[PDB]
Amino acid sequence: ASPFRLASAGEISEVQGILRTAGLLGPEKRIAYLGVLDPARGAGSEAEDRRFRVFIHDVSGARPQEVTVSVTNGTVISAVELDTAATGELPVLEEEFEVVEQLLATDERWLKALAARNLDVSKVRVAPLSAGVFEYAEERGRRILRGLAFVQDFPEDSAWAHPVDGLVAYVDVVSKEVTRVIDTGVFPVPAEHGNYTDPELTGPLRTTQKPISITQPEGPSFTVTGGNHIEWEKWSLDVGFDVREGVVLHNIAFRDGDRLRPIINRASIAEMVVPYGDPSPIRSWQNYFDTGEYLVGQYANSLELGCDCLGDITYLSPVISDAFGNPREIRNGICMHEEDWGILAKHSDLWSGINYTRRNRRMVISFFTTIGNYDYGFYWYLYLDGTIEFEAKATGVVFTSAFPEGGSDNISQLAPGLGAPFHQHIFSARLDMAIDGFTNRVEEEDVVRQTMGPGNERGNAFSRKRTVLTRESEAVREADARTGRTWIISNPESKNRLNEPVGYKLHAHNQPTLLADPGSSIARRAAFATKDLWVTRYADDERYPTGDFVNQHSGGAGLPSYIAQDRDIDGQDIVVWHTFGLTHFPRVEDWPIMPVDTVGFKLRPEGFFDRSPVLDVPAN
Amino acid sequence: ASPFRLASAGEISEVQGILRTAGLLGPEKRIAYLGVLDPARGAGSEAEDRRFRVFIHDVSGARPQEVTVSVTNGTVISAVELDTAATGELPVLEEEFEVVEQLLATDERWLKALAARNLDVSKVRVAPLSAGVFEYAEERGRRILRGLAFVQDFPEDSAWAHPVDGLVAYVDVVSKEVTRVIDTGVFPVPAEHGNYTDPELTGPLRTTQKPISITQPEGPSFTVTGGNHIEWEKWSLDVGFDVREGVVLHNIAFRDGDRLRPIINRASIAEMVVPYGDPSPIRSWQNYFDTGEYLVGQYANSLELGCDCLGDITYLSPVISDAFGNPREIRNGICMHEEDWGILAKHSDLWSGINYTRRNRRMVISFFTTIGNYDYGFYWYLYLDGTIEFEAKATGVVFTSAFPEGGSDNISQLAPGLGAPFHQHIFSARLDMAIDGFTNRVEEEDVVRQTMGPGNERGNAFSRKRTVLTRESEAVREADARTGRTWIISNPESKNRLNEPVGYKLHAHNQPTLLADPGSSIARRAAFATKDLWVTRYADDERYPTGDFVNQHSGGAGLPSYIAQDRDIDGQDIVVWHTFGLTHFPRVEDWPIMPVDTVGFKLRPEGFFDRSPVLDVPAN
Ligand SMILES: [Cu+2]
Ligand SMILES: [Cu+2]
Ligand code: NA
Ligand code: NA
């Protein structure tokens, strides 16, 4: 019954039938994206209308289309033809990956480059990578992928150990022609293998680890109703899944006595970019938009009990569309469980004689995705005390290159002759806020140092200041770790019992933002990543910080364009966009498979409650 | 047999006997500090000689003494008379705290102040706090405590809810004299109670929490030998305990193949300061040096199984001296256990078809201390992948004041009429480094942004730079989160298989350092807290960043005096001192008992290993 329920297999089949009968899904058509639309703003929305948004690719070269369909009524709502040279290309299709390696295998320029290196073409894997927008005028309006080569010595070999440097090819995957093959010179192909399953590399496995058993003999403390509605320890929320963004959280609310109090209307990771910092022309174009160009949800892993998710696990199995409109289930794609989280509060009081200890817990909602060599885990945590936290876990295999003789300022050495170019992993969290309702504002809070003098004779005082962000043109903010800078989202019309506006404080990790030169292509296309915090006025169509069609878009779409409207954000329906990321100088310990590293952010209540919200937790 | 074993009850009794026999511990003497000395530099050295350092107070006013004793040989090694007006007072004795409230209860100025407020002296608790060094010349050379008053309505009442603002008293605890009583005016005593176990305040306790059972069917994976030597998942270390510093880690090493490789010789929290930022004369003197003035190990809690430490727990019960030299056991004062820590590494490879997942775990060594209203947890973590992390957990009851009717720039309101002054909690970690041995150096690593142009035509390149710190005068460093600044401790004489020096990288949280005016008393006494990182050359007597005698000591000791020696630190026996802390603007949710907040740091290997050190972890 819930408008926020997960898409079902039957819904996707109905969408396919509607498209087919409308003449929009012929044999030359492919679905590049399909997802359910959120309800529009309407607190009295009663009539159910489940609508789906679809991007339709044409493999014969005709213009693609954006289509909205109503599955409730069986109708096409709208269908518009897209001019991709203007508004950007559609996301990369899984089936286009294979095309790159196959086309190059018969190209005379590619074969001659491999022959010079004495490489068997049947052993050369090609990583198909997004193209971006650079100096090649012939690429405007065409679907381009770029390919980098790796050698696989045998079918189970890790090809990432054997990059073929000095060689790159560009491919039109619709006309199926190789536009350029660039050979800048012969580099030795690194010869050591990186097979982390090979006993010769691992040595004998440890026998010292004894089991840790985590069980819940009475079952978990949360309930799941209507397929994806969660109730847990005063929290209430809906767990969504979109093929582009992955797990999306809706309607995050907290039960304070007898009021259900909204906190966040919609939370998602709305973009993720991986820019590389190697100036070699072989790789200087390399920037993954894993969300916008590849769609992270379609590569979600099936998560194995006892290995990926340990404990008393409740799974969700989201359904997505394949390229032909058939439903595909991602079995066990989302793990949900609760975890002990140490001490919540503790005090031993000398004067009263009372000793008091309580334990903390968190609810975990997670999924894992694999995009080529990298694997990313996305974790949302809810804590007993009202804290909300996101954490990204980065693992997988580093992207490799040759390590030049004489060294490099932009590449790490991992093994003899084997390099790993410097890069970043930068995320954008889109937080459609609803602190006690939709009338919200953001304040920037800095620590204030005070000088010794009258009214501060001992020079010990310090203070803080808050600055309200009132218009979008002033709501593009930078971190300042030295002044303890945080941002407070408050509701000026909802006060706590002390007559102060209720709020939540965003705590950033204050990691570096995008390092590329401000005039670069990547800085224009990933403008969101150049600043830590953006605030916009809510609009239904402003969904992604990079725009709807990221692939081969020339730049400026998304947040720079939204912000330019300069709308009032002081006590309005607002959206917070937080940039955060990891700057990765690969170390030897990241090879041949990388131990997890993490980054994230959290939100803590700031006078939202009238006192601690966990006084009613029992002693166990 | 190990020279790093915990002090035994017999050793402490033997120290008492040696001091008594020597004429140093008559009835007027009190032991203010007693602890075991680490072995001097030298492998093997003088067979094995267990030496203890003792600070001896005299309750009749005679000069105190610092004494070193050999318990092995039954001898006093040295005994020096201290000039406390010059070099500082001894740490506060537990028996001196009780004196303050009793003395004030018979002072007519104190009684007159309470009568003016209609308060019954029998219900007034006095918090006895360290005095610091300010403008009162009569305090030089005397042991002073300052007292702030709180009303306890009944024996089980939380007195912290009822501060008596406008009133402070200073007490000479040796001569038993009230030196000054300062009354700046009557403030209403806040009337709401803060009794977090009162059902009237908690409401009915939750019935929704189902149990989480964490068990180890085959027992834990670590072994404890010789009382305090641990081996766990290739790590090797000794767990010490000192009444001043608390838990101290010795000889942290990692078994890499056949060789035991040192990493850290000694790790401790060597000072912690809690400065308050309220300029009211009632509190502008308030600064706790919990380690140096109070001795945090002395107030360690006994940790209860299932509440404080959950899982398969191994306890240590350290022994300390009471003020007369009798051994006192802190039963179950240190918890040790291993914990599951999620995914360690994961990759699903399209080309090889291999799916790979491994789980991480960490070893936890923890203790908790209670000093008045505050409770602090100290946590050391060792991870499978070579990471070492420290975390401080702050909880307890916030220190309160009246909330002034016109508002305040330096105090938060928590309840009607009840304030909580702004303050910080700042720690100093002393890391006696030994990366692959004692020849170490520190490099500061910053991200380097590059301009678009020749050799960087697409404006994507970025790099890093490392600066060696070669002398102590250049080794006082500040954080810079915007440039991703970290510090690398390396061994220039020990290279990995790529012929790079082995190293470890220190990752700070980049929180604000000390906020007080640089001219203030606290900035001079806690100079270490004004900078994020200090490096010194190792010396036996340079133990604490604030010096040996912190109580009522002006500046002149500690890190600023050590670094003036300007010693060579480039490939030498060095010590890293890292400042980190929390800046606390109390929120309503911190009342009436505060949920845990945390701060810490971590060290990660940086080319210490020749590849990932966790390739031999099994699937299980
Ligand atoms: Cu990376
Ligand atoms: Cu605090
Ligand atoms: Na909003
Ligand atoms: Na050292």
CA–CA dist B481, B513 (Å, integer): 13
Name residue B221's amino acid.
Answer: S
Report residue B184 as tokens. Answer: 């700046």
Minimal CA–CA distance to A148: which of A135, A166, A122?
Answer: A166
> Collapsing DSSP states into helix, strand and coil, what is residue A362?
strand
Find the angle CA(B52)-CA(B57)-CA(B61) to the nearest 5 degrees: 155
Give how far Cα A69 sits from Cα of A298, A611, B131, Å: 21, 48, 74
First to last CA, chain A: 37
Neighbours of A81 (CB within 10 A): 9
Minimal CA–CA distance to A430: which of A317, A268, A246?
Answer: A268
What residues contact residue B283 under an 8 Å CB cut-off, 6+ apart?
A: B148, B168, B276, B401, B421
CA–CA dist A77, A323 (Å, integer): 21
Could you tell me if A519 and B452 are in contact, meaning their C-beta atoms sit under 8 angstroms apart?
A: yes
Map out the domains of chain B as residue ranges: 1-87, 94-195, 196-619
Running DSSP on this structure, what letter comes out for residue A4?
Answer: T
CA–CA dist B225, B1 (Å, integer): 11
- Do B1-87 and B94-195 come out as alike in CATH topology? yes
**CB contact A618 to B (< 8 Å):** yes
Name residue A294's amino acid.
Answer: Y
Could you tell me if B422 and B412 are in contact, meaning their C-beta atoms sit under 8 angstroms apart?
A: yes
Report residue B288 as tokens. Answer: 């706790």
> Collapsing DSSP states into helix, strand and coil, what is residue A142?
coil
Q: Which long-range contacts (CB under 8 A, 24 or more apart) does B235-239 make?
A: B235/B363, B235/B382, B236/B260, B237/B382, B238/B2, B238/B4, B238/B5, B239/B6, B239/B316, B239/B334, B239/B336, B239/B365
Residue with tokens 């290279």: B495
> Collapsing DSSP states into helix, strand and coil, what is residue A302?
coil
Minimal CA–CA distance to B113: which of B179, B178, B167?
Answer: B167
According to DSSP, the β-strands at B574-584 and B423-433 are antiparallel
Minimal CA–CA distance to A503: which of A466, A459, A454, A537?
Answer: A466
Which residues does residue A575 pair with via DSSP β-bridges, in sequence order? A432, A536
- State phi, psi for B281 to the nearest 5 degrees: -60, -20
Could you tell me if B485 and B479 are in contact, meaning their C-beta atoms sit under 8 angstroms apart?
A: yes
CA–CA dist A74, A78 (Å, integer): 13
CA–CA dist A84, A67 (Å, integer): 15
CA atoms within 13 A on the CB side of A587: 23
Measured in angstroms, how far is the CA atom of residue A423 from the centroid of ligand 1?
6
Report residue B71 as tokens. Answer: 């318990």
The number of angstroms, rounded, from the C-alpha of B587 to the middle of its chain's C-alpha atoms is: 24
What residues contact residue B541 under an 8 Å CB cut-off, 6+ apart?
A: none
CA–CA dist B274, B294 (Å, integer): 12
Q: What is the CA radius of gyration of chain A?
A: 26
Ligand nearest to the CA of B433: 4
- State phi, psi for A473 to the nearest 5 degrees: -65, -20
Report residue A232 as tokens. Answer: 């847990």
Residue with tokens 């500690």: B558
Residue with tokens 């070893």: B363
> Which residues precede gaps in chain A, with C-N > 2.5 A?
none
CA–CA dist B209, A617 (Å, integer): 8
Report residue A127 as tokens. Answer: 């990583």
Does A431 carry a binding-site annotation?
A: no
**CB contact A258 to B (< 8 Å):** no
Residue with tokens 């310090």: A462
Residues of B in contact with A308 (CB under 8 A): 343, 346, 357
Torsion, Cα A165 A167 A168 A173, to 10 degrees, reads: -120
Task: Transcribe B449-468 into DSSP letters.
Answer: E--SBTTBTTS--EEEEEEE
Does B238 carry a binding-site annotation?
A: no
Neighbours of B406 (CB within 10 A): 5
Helix locations, A189-230, DSSP H: 199-202
Could you tell me if B579 and B533 are in contact, meaning their C-beta atoms sit under 8 angstroms apart?
A: yes
Could you tell me if B194 and B160 are in contact, meaning their C-beta atoms sit under 8 angstroms apart?
A: yes
Does A372 carry a binding-site annotation?
A: yes
Which residues does residue A490 pair with via DSSP β-bridges, in sequence order? A441, A503
According to DSSP, the β-strands at A594-606 and A388-396 are antiparallel
Could you tell me if A32 and A55 are in contact, meaning their C-beta atoms sit under 8 angstroms apart?
A: yes
Name residue B254's amino acid.
Answer: F
Minimal CA–CA distance to B6: which of B220, B331, B287, B238?
Answer: B238
Could you tell me if B418 and B402 are in contact, meaning their C-beta atoms sit under 8 angstroms apart?
A: yes
- Domain spanning A94-195 has what CATH number? 3.10.450.40
**CB contact A585 to B (< 8 Å):** yes
The interface residues of chain B toward chain A in range 120-139, judged by CB-CB distance below 8 A, are 125, 134
CA atoms within 13 A on the CB side of A188: 10
Could you tell me if B404 and B411 are in contact, meaning their C-beta atoms sit under 8 angstroms apart?
A: yes
Element (H, E) at B371: strand B355-371
What residues contact residue A545 under an 8 Å CB cut-off, 6+ apart?
A: A270, A271, A428, A430, A528, A534, A558, A559, A577
What is the experimental resolution, given in Å to one decimal place?
A: 1.7
Selected from 2.160.10.10, 3.10.450.40, 3.40.50.150, 3.90.660.10, the CATH number assigned to the domain covering B1-87 reads 3.10.450.40
Helix locations, A430-586, DSSP H: 521-525, 559-563
Which residues does residue B3 pair with via DSSP β-bridges, in sequence order? none
Find the angle CA(B440)-CA(B445)-CA(B451) to the nearest 5 degrees: 150
Measured in angstroms, how far is the CA atom of residue A442 from the centroid of ligand 3?
11
Does B379 carry a binding-site annotation?
A: no
Minimal CA–CA distance to B424: which of B518, B508, B530, B576?
Answer: B530
Could you tell me if B608 and B435 are in contact, meaning their C-beta atoms sit under 8 angstroms apart?
A: yes
The interface residues of chain A toward chain B in range 101-120, judged by CB-CB distance below 8 A, are none
Helix locations, B68-127, DSSP H: 84-87, 94-104, 108-116
Minimal CA–CA distance to B84: which of B104, B108, B65, B106?
Answer: B65
Which residues does residue B600 pair with via DSSP β-bridges, in sequence order? B391
Report residue A259 as tokens. Answer: 């009021």
According to DSSP, the β-strands at A65-70 and A246-256 are unpaired
Burial of A391 (0-12, 13-18, 19+ CB in 10 A): middle
Among candidates A197, A483, A512 on the partner chain, residue whose Cβ is nearest the Cβ of B356: A197
CA–CA dist B402, B117 (Å, integer): 14
Residues of B in contact with A413 (CB under 8 A): 498, 500
The interface residues of chain A toward chain B in range 459-478, judged by CB-CB distance below 8 A, are 459-464
Q: CA of B588 to nearest chain A CA: how many angstroms apart?
A: 5
The interface residues of chain B toward chain A in range 371-430, judged by CB-CB distance below 8 A, are 372-373, 375, 377, 385-386, 393, 395-397, 409-410, 413, 415-416, 422
Q: CA of B616 to nearest chain A CA: how many angstroms apart?
A: 5
Neighbours of B154 (CB within 10 A): 9
- Domain spanning A196-619 has what CATH number? 2.70.98.20
Torsion, Cα A8 A10 A14 A15, to 10 degrees, reads: 20
